Amino acid sequence: RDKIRLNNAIWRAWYIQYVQR
C-alpha cells in the first residue's frame, strides 16, 4: 500500500524534474 504510494511519487516527481527543468 505504501509501495503503491512510493511508485506514484517517483513517477510524478520524474516529470517534475526532467520536463519542467
Residues that bind other proteins (CB under 8 A): 1, 4-5, 8-9, 12-16, 18-19
Q: Provide the minimum distance between the beta carbon of 17 and other proteins in the complex, in angstroms, as a whole number.
A: 9
Q: Provide the minimum distance between the beta carbon of 12 and other proteins in the complex, in angstroms, as a whole number.
A: 6
CA end-to-end distance (rounded Å), the chain: 30
Q: Provide the minimum distance between the beta carbon of 18 and other proteins in the complex, in angstroms, as a whole number.
A: 6
- For 1-21, b/e burial (b = at least 16 CB within 10 A) is eeeeeeeeeeeeeeeeeeeee
